[PDB]
């Protein structure tokens, strides 16, 4: 009955690319928990257990953004819907394929806008196997954006052995969708590119002056520091993805005289104060920038880069901007960088990190302090899972403010049977607070140490024994 | 202020290609702005009393020629009465813009209702250059959601303006321009495996499947000329099926699409894919085709198509009394390329299918989203009006092409108030409604309604005629709008269909 | 399996006072209908069948407000929830006990019954679950514990009940009580709206009562007299919505407003309200000079209306309302369409005592008035029928405009197998509807009535009274043609004469 | 505009009895400090919104007043989710104050609240500021009424959105005055039929039932002199059950209430009634009694009660190891009139029920709405603050607040100890952590991290240590054994 379906659902999820499931102990109990246990011991799926339902949601988000695969989270409680809320909101705005599994019972008496779909299974053979597997492929497709190009969370409810397809394939195969919507842009108009979360890669814009957020993959080689923007007057703005970070960016995007062209990978598009003139997925370009425009942009960029480096050296104290500058100087191709969505991602932008070669993650969907520790842990687990399937696991470095670390300190309560990352290092920046991070870390039995900003590079260079936290005052 | 907001919203909707607005009067500034645009000739106002039939009138105005259409509400039972039309517009993917006028402080003083059905539910700001951009941006975003400019999933949008001319772009341009989106998802299909195409509502055109035997619902656009009658399907052994669009009509289709042992390939124009098969093997938007169908497979399917058609026509002629199936056959024979055919969503659309209508050259419409009784008269009127609008716009001085609707008496009676049109409101010039009047578990337990009295009540020309007169009567143009009633028998219906079955 | 579930659920509904159920032919559902069919054959319930789902909702509205009972509508289709929407909204704002059998915000409860489990082992404890939930539905719908009746949504996807037919979970109707201190020597007017209670200790005060409000006393104050007076203080009963002078006064920030309601909800106009309760604990008595002023302005309002109607040659809708008012008798039920008829009856001065006045004042929509009148007449006749009393059923008289008639003309589509009222008479005041606001139109009402085989007659206003005194011809429609051109100047002539 | 809008709603809230506000951090924010600086409200600041919601719940249950949480973020409302569920089921008047922007959201829960009210976008209206005063204060008076149950008798959480000083009434009165509402629904009950009273969360007080044997959850206000231990109930067969409030605690209660043979009478303070019994025969708010209980019934219940009490007491003494039940019993024996007791909602509340606590003169709090582990630390802090604050207004030593919570619950909500140095801090809150291990978490280190006084003590020191106040907030950790708990419970049941 509900045992046979549970095993078909799990098998179909695995065939759809689910490698990780996060589970919470329940007031009742997890839809298909035994079938998940079975798949874990088999090596087919990796299970993760957490007491806190909220940090469980962010652990799954991390497991999704670390290598780009869909992830399941099995609710089990009367508190569960409400605790996963923040993670579902983040998964919606950041377009993260989070599958929320649950169970409600038909035999007993009885997320809305944020999810891409709400699918309920038939309660309860050969034909029924086909109805269970199609439903699960539909869950996966909506979650991964396979048809919509708009990934996001999905609520999948199971009301509480038979073969799938030959050769391990999804019951219902849905190939890669190409979403495409070309836009004429003339590049001899003085243009700046603003790159935000979820931006695509555009080789025909690679030469333009580009203000790129740390999570935005860069198409080229001509960066423009954000603090250089108020010193320039673009006639035209190309906006990739959804940029939120800086005030001169918002000011420029809300200037009625400056045409903004929005280029996205999915069907959503943003505005600031309704001044977007046109949408697309890519540009068909004519012209080339004025050399005088490029020179001026380049000069204002050196000028801004210089004024940050000077005022950092000018300051005796170690601010959070010094910490960001030292982390950036220490990263190397192949690293994953996970940034807290508040000050870390802003400080890394100002310190001028060159992100090419680096996999940068941040919960930019709602930019909440919430959940950064579990997100970093989940990203590291999934990223190291990807490397294992190809020498030593590549580093994951996380930058987190001290309030954010203590807020999500529950992410550190990991039982000894649960998967732990090999190469995660969390750098905490201690900028009215009073908490002792070192006591916090020993309470949860996590190697921790205070260090000066000068020594972060060398300390980061030496592989640590597992999960560690570096506190910087 | 609210007057500025309403004149901006209207101007932006016109740049989006809204040509027709349906207005339900109540209580306000939006109403005058539409009055200005209509008097200017920039749009076409339609005023209706009943909010429900107004939504179905908008459906018809939208599917008549493919444009986005607005329904403006100014009332409290307003959104609730547009429910049925919003559901229809959801499942049939119709760009319907529901403009509401919410009064927030008054609902508090007593002491997104549509929810999942709409593509978007966007509140405008309660009523200088900054607010112009906020208002026109919100409106271009309403328009794109409704037409599927970026999603390829058109449908209904809730647009709420609460209540207590700054220009748009040069050259009549939409504020935020959204160019053509192509959504692409090829599937590899081998045509040497014995294949039939099932084509439903919303199906795209596929020239590389033109040769295959195709069971096409009346509203599906055909890609070829190798039709396969739906009653022929159970007499054949296809090894795989290509599903276009969202088919719902026939039991042989549903029984075949539930055939666990037959692979189904689902091709659609947008992101949704139908549930009807649990053995769907692959979903996509177009086929990449290896090979070709065997000539012996084509000949067998062509032969069985001819056989099912002949059995239907033979049993019709041997059956002593006029049924709705006879009426549908007679309508089908009377149509000609350029005609628009509007079909009631219950028996008429099935009966036209059984009668074997050849739909190439004909624009066939039917509310196949939920296939309700409601609104068929208003849908046919709006479809006639928009389709005539496009032909007027072509320059040809010729009489507008015909719109012919086929609806049952119960549906006609139930939406008869769709005929209540003010003297100053747009009337179709070449709309003919054929009413197949066959009178019709505790509910099962029967009308006796006088259809000609009903038309007299709304001052619509109406004539009772026999099935053999229908063709010649339809050939003769009449009043702009008219109703032709054909009496029919429902008791012998079971007997006719059993005869058709046994004759195969 | 299911059969047992539907039979107990129907049985509990009948125990809970449900006498009428409305049903639509639909694509799905039979057992729910079978259990209802049995109960209809045996005379326990009366089933009504309708094809238009919107019509069915308003028919059930009428069956509920005619004699105060909960009523079920049983949905059966994919268009059903969406068509039942307008009636659920009306039921919500007018606090009508409408049970919807298979909305979110609009309903008092959304209950799902257990999918029936096929084990006769547990049929005695799982009887009790089914009846409890049914009693939970009835209590939410009738306001048994909340004092806030409204629509409920009840999902169903021979073991007995309590002895003596008692409902399973007995909830004695509640007393909700919240006394408010009010000094009646301050010059007070009472504004009585929809859903108002009866207050004996306020009976002497000048009272502007909407036609659906029960009169507490014998001191009426015409709404047109209100702008000619300065109340120092207002007592607002229920939820008044009718007149702009009332909205102006209720809005006035200088005038304290005391809201007295029968349920937990309370209204405001412009957040003006100083206090809320359910009853007045009064000190004092109205100053005689205040009662004199109010009575004198009441007379001038009444005189201005009747005189200017007589000096007006063309028959308006206000003439029709006046004639219907003059023909009413104690024991009649009056049903008013929600726009002009209820306003015009208030203007013409109806004394409502002895009269049961119904109107869909929750959202005041044009929709559903024909079926609401039909439903109200059926439930009212059926109550009087259960007194055993040998006199023939009392008249129901509905007054509606032309537009409302065509808008709900589908309500006249009644099979010969269905309950039809014995003494219902629908007066249509036909005003023929500028292009948007005026809504000009021509409908032949008599052609429409003939299409549905309903007796109809177009008559003059003067014949209305005599024609109304006639015996019951079953169900009839009486049309009186009316002119809206002269309406603007008749109203102005009343004000100037005021 | 926005600025004066914020100032007036803050002022109406204060008129309607709001004394504490919890702020997660614009004009609404600034309206609160001036009222906090003026001493009109006491403002509390928190960084974690889930934590802020549970602190507010504690502030509301500590003394029965309405409490606002003011929030300004997008993750804001979602993070307040679990506290809103608790406030719904426990009927806690929590006003969720929300401030955010529609255009900004465009340019990128509902069933739990008693009301969702969006206030008007501030319009300057220099000449309409009078009618804008009235529309904002009225709406704030609706929010307070819906929250406190002033007309419904059904208190709960309210969503009050303000999107993005003109005087109130004379003499500090609220804009719309709602007097006391009594909801009354008499029920005829004959007490000569053998009756047990089961009193749950939210139970009222009924003098005419005082002589009946009564199984009372720890949070149930007691009205009688005749308790019946919960372990005694399986050993009896009542002929009638009177169910007070919403009982959730014990499996023998569920089994008896689901027993098809036993008529159940439901008496509640509000219009809701529990569905625990499918055989609920009737529901009301008070009983009108005929008769009186038969002496033989009263004798049998008193004897069963004595056996249960003796079984617990004697098997605790004979047990060679400290368990959570020894800790619960030691906390019970150390309580005195005036104390406030806060219980974590899994084991502590059950263990205090079996230890057989006498709740007379004791105010007992527990998040019995959904009985989750979330926010127990913050609820206790909030209950202590509000309880202490109601003692200062009486004009009289701050009374003790003692909290008993398991170690996993303490770990989970330990970040509720993160309290800024300007923020209000309890005078006399002692958290007793009963640590049977559940993780490997050092609880003492956790208290270090938040700079909270902490000691590990043995169970027989707890009574002594509890009158040694020291810091305003302290944590007392009692190590306990979980390995022998099944045997202790079996020894108790076997001795019944």
What's D373's domain CATH number? 3.40.50.970
Partner residue opposite B185 with nearest CB, options A147, A267, A280: A147
- Structure letter (DSSP) for residue C419: -
Contact B152, B136 (CB under 8 A): no
Phi-psi group of B17: left, alpha or beta (phi > 0 → left; psi -120 to 50 → alpha; rest → beta): left
Phi-psi group of B66: left, alpha or beta (phi > 0 → left; psi -120 to 50 → alpha; rest → beta): left
- Structure letter (DSSP) for residue D398: P
Q: By the CB < 8 Å criterion, does C129 face chain A?
A: yes
C285 by DSSP, 3-state: which?
Answer: coil
Number of Cβ atoms within 10 Å of the Cβ of C7? 19
Q: Which residue of B has its CA nearest to D163?
A: B125
Q: Which residue has the tokens 């659609």?
A: B268
Phi-psi group of A429: left, alpha or beta (phi > 0 → left; psi -120 to 50 → alpha; rest → beta): beta
Q: Does B285 lie in the same domain as B250?
A: yes
Q: Which residue of B has its CA nearest to A146?
A: B271
Q: Which residues pair with A276 in a beta bridge?
A: A260
The whole-angstrom separation of Cα C163 and Cα D249 is: 33
Helix axes A80-94, D81-89, angle to 10 degrees: 150
Burial class (CB in 10 A: 0-12, 13-18, 19+), B317: exposed
The whole-angstrom separation of Cα C136 and Cα D274 is: 11
| Nearest residue to A164 (alpha-carbon basis) of A139, A138, A132 | A132
Q: Which residue has the tokens 């979903």?
A: B283
- Structure letter (DSSP) for residue C239: B
Q: Which residues of D touch B136 (CB under 8 A)?
A: none
Phi, psi values for residue A411, rounded to 5°:
-65, -20
Q: Which residues of C touch B31 (CB under 8 A)?
A: 436-437
Distances (CA, A) of B430 to A161, C155, D430: 62, 47, 86
| Cross-chain Cβ contact A273/B177 below 8 Å | no
Q: Does B300 lie in the same domain as B167?
A: no
Q: Does B330 lie in the same domain as B313?
A: no
Which residue, of B177, B200, B229, is where some domain finishes?
A: B177
Strands B481-487 and A46-49, by their bridges, are: unpaired
Q: By the CB < 8 Å criterion, does D185 face chain B?
A: no
The whole-angstrom separation of Cα D299 and Cα C23 is: 57
| Cross-chain Cβ contact D103/B141 below 8 Å | no
Phi-psi group of C150: left, alpha or beta (phi > 0 → left; psi -120 to 50 → alpha; rest → beta): left
The whole-angstrom separation of Cα C170 and Cα D390 is: 41
The whole-angstrom separation of Cα D449 and Cα D466 is: 23
CA within 13 Å, CB half, B13:
32
Determination technique for this PDB entry?
X-ray
Number of Cβ atoms within 10 Å of the Cβ of A64? 28
Q: Does B123 lie in the same domain as B84?
A: yes
The tokens describing B267, both together, are 């091709």
Query: Å resolution of this model?
Result: 2.2
| Nearest residue to A72 (alpha-carbon basis) of A36, A43, A37 | A36
Order of all β-strands in the sheet with D473-479: D363-366, D340-343, D401-406, D429-435, D473-479, D453-456
The whole-angstrom separation of Cα A114 and Cα A305 is: 40
The whole-angstrom separation of Cα C91 and Cα B77 is: 12
Q: Does B296 lie in the same domain as B186?
A: yes
| Cross-chain Cβ contact B122/D139 below 8 Å | no
The tokens describing D196, both together, are 């047990």
Strands (E), C107-228: 109-112, 152-155, 175-177, 179-183, 188-192, 207-209
The whole-angstrom separation of Cα A359 and Cα A335 is: 6
B179, B260, B262, B273: best mutation site toward chain A, by most A Cβ within 10 Å?
Answer: B179
A104, A105, A107, A109: best mutation site toward chain C, by most C Cβ within 10 Å?
Answer: A109
The whole-angstrom separation of Cα C188 and Cα C166 is: 46
Determine the Cα angle at C47 with ends C43 and C48, to 5°: 145
Phi, psi values for residue D314, rounded to 5°:
-75, -35
CA within 13 Å, CB half, A395:
22
CA dihedral C112, C113, C118, C120 (to 10 degrees): 160
Distances (CA, A) of C97 to B34, C63, C107, C173: 40, 10, 10, 14
| D407 Cβ contact list (under 8 Å, min separation 6) | D433, D434, D435, D436, D437, D438, D441, D443
Contact C133, C16 (CB under 8 A): no
| Cross-chain Cβ contact B80/C85 below 8 Å | yes
Contact B144, B150 (CB under 8 A): yes
Q: Which residue has the tokens 């603007």?
A: C488
Q: Which residues pair with D241 in a beta bridge?
A: D196, D264
- Structure letter (DSSP) for residue A96: -
The tokens describing D229, both together, are 């231990």
CA dihedral A150, A153, A154, A158 (to 10 degrees): 160
Q: Does C329 lie in the same domain as C300?
A: no
Q: Which residue has the tokens 């639909």?
A: C26
In chain A, which among 243-262 make CB contacts under 8 A with chain B?
256
Number of Cβ atoms within 10 Å of the Cβ of D334? 17
Q: Does B211 lie in the same domain as B67?
A: no
Helix axes C487-496, C317-327, angle to 10 degrees: 70
Phi, psi values for residue C397, rounded to 5°:
-125, 120
The whole-angstrom separation of Cα C151 and Cα A121 is: 30
Q: Which residue has the tokens 């695969």?
A: A69
| D254 Cβ contact list (under 8 Å, min separation 6) | D276
The whole-angstrom separation of Cα D277 and Cα D257 is: 5
Roughly how many angstroms between the first and final C-alpha of chain C, as a whole number?
70
The whole-angstrom separation of Cα A37 and Cα A29 is: 13
A407 by DSSP, 3-state: which?
Answer: helix
Order of all β-strands in the sheet with C455-458: C356-359, C333-336, C396-401, C423-430, C474-481, C455-458
Q: Does B185 lie in the same domain as B167?
A: no
- Structure letter (DSSP) for residue A121: P
Listing DSSP states for D209-240 in one string gives GTTS-EEE-TTSPP--S-B--GGGGGG---SE
Phi, psi values for residue B484, rounded to 5°:
-115, 115
Q: By the CB < 8 Å criterion, does B124 face chain D?
A: no
Phi-psi group of C95: left, alpha or beta (phi > 0 → left; psi -120 to 50 → alpha; rest → beta): left
Q: Does C379 lie in the same domain as C255?
A: no
- Structure letter (DSSP) for residue D415: G
Element (H, E) at A46: strand A46-49
The whole-angstrom separation of Cα B101 and Cα B119 is: 19
Query: How many structural domains compose chain C?
Result: 3
Residue C95 domain boundaries? 1-170
Q: Does B188 lie in the same domain as B144?
A: no
| Cross-chain Cβ contact D75/A89 below 8 Å | yes
Phi, psi values for residue C468, rounded to 5°:
-75, -30
Strands (E), C54-206: 71-74, 98-101, 109-112, 152-155, 175-177, 179-183, 188-192
Phi, psi values for residue C84, rounded to 5°:
-80, -10
Q: By the CB < 8 Å criterion, does B13 face chain C?
A: no
Contact D266, D243 (CB under 8 A): yes
The whole-angstrom separation of Cα B44 and Cα B60 is: 14
Contact A113, C121 (CB under 8 A): no
**Per-residue b/e over D75-105, b at no fewer than 16 CB within 10 Å?**
bbbbbbbbbbbbbbbbbbbbbbbbbbebbee
C109 by DSSP, 3-state: which?
Answer: strand
The tokens describing B282, both together, are 């692959």
The whole-angstrom separation of Cα B211 and Cα D31 is: 74
Q: Does B225 lie in the same domain as B306?
A: yes
Helix axes B493-503, B324-334, angle to 10 degrees: 70
The whole-angstrom separation of Cα B161 and Cα B175 is: 19
* Helices (H), ranges, C152-276: 244-251
Q: Does C331 lie in the same domain as C246?
A: no
Number of Cβ atoms within 10 Å of the Cβ of B435? 28
Partner residue opposite D138 with nearest CB, options C136, C175, C271: C271
Q: By the CB < 8 Å criterion, does A107 face chain C?
A: yes
CA within 13 Å, CB half, D77:
19
Q: Which residues of C touch B457 (CB under 8 A)?
A: 443-445, 447-448, 451
| Nearest residue to D316 (alpha-carbon basis) of D332, D327, D302 | D327
Determine the Cα angle at D286 with ends D255 and D193, to 5°: 55
- Structure letter (DSSP) for residue C162: S
Q: By the CB < 8 Å criterion, does C174 face chain D?
A: yes
Contact D122, D53 (CB under 8 A): no
The whole-angstrom separation of Cα D411 and Cα D433 is: 10
Contact A76, A25 (CB under 8 A): yes
What Rg do the C-alpha atoms of chain A give, in angstroms? 23
CA dihedral C357, C360, C365, C368 (to 10 degrees): -90
């Amino acid at each position: 009955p509900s045992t046979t379906q549970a095993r078909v659902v799990v098998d179909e999820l695995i065939r759809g690319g689910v490698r990780d499931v996060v589970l919470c102990p329940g007031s009742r109990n997890a839809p298909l928990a035994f079938a998940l246990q079975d798949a874990d011991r088999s090596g087919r799926i990796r299970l993760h257990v957490r007491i806190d339902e909220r940090t469980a949601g962010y652990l799954a988000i991390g497991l999704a953004i670390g290598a780009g695969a869909p992830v399941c989270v099995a609710m089990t409680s009367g508190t569960a819907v409400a605790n996963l809320g923040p993670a579902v909101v983040e998964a919606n705005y950041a377009r993260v394929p989070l599958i929320v599994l649950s169970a409600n019972r038909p035999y007993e008496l009885l997320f809305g806008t944020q999810v891409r779909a709400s699918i309920s299974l038939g309660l309860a053979t050969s034909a029924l196997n086909a109805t269970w597997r199609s439903a699960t492929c539909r869950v996966l497709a909506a979650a991964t954006g396979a048809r919509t190009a708009n990934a996001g969370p999905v609520h999948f409810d199971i009301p509480l052995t038979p073969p799938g397809r030959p050769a391990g394939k999804p019951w219902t195969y849905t190939p890669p969708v190409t979403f495409d919507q070309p836009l004429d842009i003339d590049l001899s108009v003085d243009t700046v590119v603003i790159s935000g979360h979820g931006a695509g890669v555009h080789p025909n814009l690679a030469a333009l002056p580009t203000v790129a957020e740390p999570t935005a993959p860069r198409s080229g080689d001509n960066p423009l520091h954000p603090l250089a923007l108020p010193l320039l007057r673009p006639q035209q703005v190309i906006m990739l993805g959804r940029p939120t970070l800086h005030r001169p960016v918002s000011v420029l995007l809300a200037d009625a005289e400056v045409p903004v062209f929005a280029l996205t990978t999915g069907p959503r598009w943003p505005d600031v104060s309704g001044n977007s003139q046109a949408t697309g997925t890519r540009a068909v370009t004519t012209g080339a920038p004025r050399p005088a425009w490029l020179d001026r942009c380049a000069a204002m960029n050196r000028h801004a880069i210089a004024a940050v480096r000077e005022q950092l050296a000018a300051h005796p104290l170690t601010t959070g901007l010094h910490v960001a500058a030292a982390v950036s100087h220490a990263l190397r191709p192949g690293d994953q960088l996970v940034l807290g969505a508040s000050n870390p991602v802003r400080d890394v932008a100002l310190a001028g990190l060159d992100t090419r070669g680096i996999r940068v993650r941040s919960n930019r969907g709602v930019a909440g302090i919430d959940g950064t520790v579990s997100t970093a842990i989940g990203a590291a687990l999934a990223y190291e899972g990807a490397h294992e399937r190809t020498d030593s696991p590549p580093r994951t470095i996380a930058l987190i403010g001290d309030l954010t670390f203590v807020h999500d300190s529950s992410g550190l309560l990991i039982g000894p049977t649960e998967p732990i990352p090999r190469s995660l290092t969390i750098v905490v920046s201690n900028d009215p607070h009073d908490v002792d991070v070192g006591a916090l870390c020993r309470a949860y039995h996590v190697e921790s140490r205070q260090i000066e900003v000068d020594e972060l590079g060398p300390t980061l260079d030496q592989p640590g024994a597992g999960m560690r936290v570096l506190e910087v005052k």
